[PDB]
Design a protein around this ligand. Structure first.
Ligand SMILES: CC(C)c1ccc(O)cc1
Ligand SMILES: CC(C)c1ccc(O)cc1
Lengths: 224, 224
């Protein structure tokens, strides 16, 4: 099938472990510290992953950073969603960090994780494929609606290149549903809504100062 | 062209006047009171408008209310956006209520109205048509991602019926861009983001208790 889709598949990062500290008593602070540490390490590999997207590295460094600063949490959440598709009412943040309802309550994340489970529910019914997941991650990056873009036309071109890949993939692989590509695009509003909820929640955790956060995570959290 | 699109065009409500009180001194409270009063009256006609959407009135009353309670601010904002397309850095809330940057600052709405102007900017470059505007309003209603839906499959069917209308319209009217329907769908994340910003802002105005609000507006603002 589509070459961009195949390329994004081989660019997919390896799995990352959460490694919650086994000497630390379980608590909301422990769970939040674990999740923010995991996100920081995922962000490093997301930056390297974006360089494989056709045309992304030819944008200015400022535009690359603007797209990443608007899309980072959407990309993180799409990953948790995809890893959770074969599970029931549980979120696979990592193979060693699967959160059920009790753990979400203990971490103060019941509302956020329920929103992520709503994304999981919809993608389960659509039978989301890995090919579609990686293409939607790239589209979410290109379509992230930063207020600070310098080269608006180049970013629109990147959007068009990735949208074309999704449409070509669906036309060849899903002839039984001529509207499947658009159904995939119609899942992006809930992803944007859930990501905004997560950014706001963890910005407030940052303000309270009880959960340590690393530099790259803090950089994304403090972006305008 | 497409019959659903033609039907939505003839169902389009008449213009509504803001009628700011000419005896009241200008202030943030006056501007916010005017906008919330306008929104309340627009909501009444939005409820009547939704009954013309094929299949909407056959949903349960609870599902109709769930969709409206999730989408109401998206529908309101799409209207302001469309009315503003021929203007520059101004928002046409009504023919008698056009807000420029100074007025937005005075009302405490600079950040919200700048986000709405970002929607305007993108639709200007795409040359958004009235046919596309009314279809996107209906899609935003059907695709509003309420947590409380009873008949998930019927709501998905409504989404599919309206998505098909958009795709059929674009296939017939815009053969020069075979991806235009998907470009239209890719504007929905920013609409969802901007609507959430507006709901949160006016929920906080409600809490502060200095701006009177009418029953229907308050009902939507207080929905879960
Ligand atoms: C910041 C939290 C919500 C988070 C951490 C890792 C991840 O893959 C997705 C989300
Ligand atoms: C509630 C405010 C933001 C508002 C009022 C009327 C309208 O058409 C769109 C928005």
């Amino acid at each position: 099938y589509n070459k961009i889709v195949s390329h994004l598949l081989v660019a997919e990062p390896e799995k990352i472990y959460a490694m919650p500290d086994p000497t630390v008593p379980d608590s909301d602070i422990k769970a939040l510290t674990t999740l923010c540490d995991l996100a920081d390490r995922e962000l490093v590999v997301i930056i390297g992953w974006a360089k494989h997207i056709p045309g992304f590295s030819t944008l200015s460094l400022a535009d690359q950073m603007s797209l990443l600063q608007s899309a980072w949490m959407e990309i993180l959440i799409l990953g948790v969603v995809y890893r959770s598709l074969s599970f029931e009412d549980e979120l696979v943040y990592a193979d060693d960090y699967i959160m059920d309802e009790d753990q979400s309550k203990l971490a103060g994340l019941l509302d956020l994780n329920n929103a992520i489970l709503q994304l999981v529910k919809k993608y389960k019914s659509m039978k989301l494929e890995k090919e579609e997941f990686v293409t939607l991650k790239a589209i979410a990056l290109a379509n992230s609606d930063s207020m600070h873009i310098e080269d608006v036309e180049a970013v629109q071109k990147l959007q068009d290149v990735l949208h074309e890949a999704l449409q070509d993939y669906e036309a060849g692989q899903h002839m039984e549903d001529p509207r499947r590509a658009g159904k995939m695009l119609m899942t992006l509003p809930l992803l944007r809504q859930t990501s905004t909820k997560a950014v706001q929640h963890f910005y407030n955790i940052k303000l309270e100062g009880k959960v340590p956060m690393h530099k790259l995570f803090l950089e994304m959290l403090e972006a305008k």
